[PDB]
């Protein structure tokens, strides 16, 4: 009832963002972009994940 | 009538305003509901129950 709301607002997508077409080099890059405010949490990007 | 009375001031009619985070200084990325609710204090005091 609160952690599920956080994980549902986090893991979600809308068709627009601060940056959407960008392609990232890993999850750390995604966190850095979200914290720096250069990308919305609901972008649709391509991350490289191991 | 609630929305008209909100218009009488300068507050948004939707009832939701923009709140920034107290510690990180960055906005919450959605309008949140802010207003004056009449909270009570029930006399189920914690020091009378510990």
């Amino acid at each position: 009832q609160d952690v599920v709301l956080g994980l549902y607002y986090m893991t979600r997508d809308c068709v627009n963002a601060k940056g959407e077409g960008m392609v990232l080099t890993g999850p750390k890059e995604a966190e850095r972009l979200y914290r720096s405010g250069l990308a919305s949490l609901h972008a649709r990007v391509k991350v490289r994940i191991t | 009538e609630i929305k008209e009375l909100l218009k009488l001031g300068d507050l948004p009619t939707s009832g939701q305003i923009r709140l920034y985070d107290g510690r990180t200084g960055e906005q919450f990325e959605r309008p949140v509901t802010v207003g004056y609710m009449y909270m009570l204090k029930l006399n189920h005091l914690v020091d009378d129950k510990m």
Binding site: G19, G21, M22, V23, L24, T25, K28, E29, E31, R32, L33, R35, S36, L38, K46, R48 | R23, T24, G25
Partner: protein, 219 residues
């Protein structure tokens, strides 16, 4: 009235290098978040550094294209170049060359040294080759800047990760001195790209913040 609990770095215990985890205590009530957020915001998007800005590969002219003999895609080449951590001396921007042929990996050790330019991870693989005739040569341009500048803000354009940090995330938890009730305990976790130490980056960011508050300080 003007006295505050001066913190001291209890431990700078390090995971595998460039992954230090610093924790200073005890902070005054509420100062943990101030210090953590200020240091994080400075380390994230305000930090001098050098990163690959743009790259020109002779065989391609478009991000959605390919070259025969290249195992990866052009997007994956740009991703490998984003992670190409480099350290550059006094020159503000240089151009590196990556002439390479023959079947095998294309590591960062096959880039021309050019003297002052030095790669901190020569084992960083950039491309893979599967054809004898596959001749790949690119001109990777590295420029000095501050913070993160996405390619969408500004002849292939690559995102420029100028700041040596890669993931900085503090965590404030409860600490107590002998009698005082509520204090803070800042726990800073930082991973860099190898061009700087995390404990060195912390003092760099602290110096940068302290220089800002020098024209209106009480000395």
């Amino acid at each position: 009235v003007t006295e505050f609990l001066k913190p001291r770095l209890v431990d700078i215990e390090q995971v595998s290098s460039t992954h230090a985890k610093v924790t200073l205590e005890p902070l005054e009530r509420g100062f943990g978040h101030t210090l953590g957020n200020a240091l994080r915001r400075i380390l994230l998007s305000s930090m001098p550094g050098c990163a690959v800005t743009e790259v020109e590969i002779d065989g391609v002219l478009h991000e959605y294209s390919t070259k025969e003999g290249v195992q990866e895609d052009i997007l994956e080449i740009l991703l490998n170049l984003k992670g190409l951590a480099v350290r550059v001396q006094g020159k503000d921007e240089v151009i590196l060359t990556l002439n390479k042929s023959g079947i095998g990996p294309v590591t960062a050790a096959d880039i021309t040294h050019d003297g002052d330019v030095e790669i901190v991870k020569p084992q960083h693989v950039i491309c893979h080759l599967t054809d004898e005739n596959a001749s790949i040569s690119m001109r990777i341009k590295v420029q000095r800047g501050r913070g993160y500048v996405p390619a969408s803000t500004r002849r292939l354009l690559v995102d420029a990760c100028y700041s040596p940090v890669e993931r900085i995330a503090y965590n404030v938890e409860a600490a107590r001195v002998e009698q005082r009730t509520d204090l803070d305990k800042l726990v800073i976790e930082m991973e860099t790209n190898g061009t700087i130490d995390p404990e060195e980056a912390i003092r760099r960011a602290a110096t940068i913040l302290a220089e800002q508050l020098e024209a209106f300080v009480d000395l």
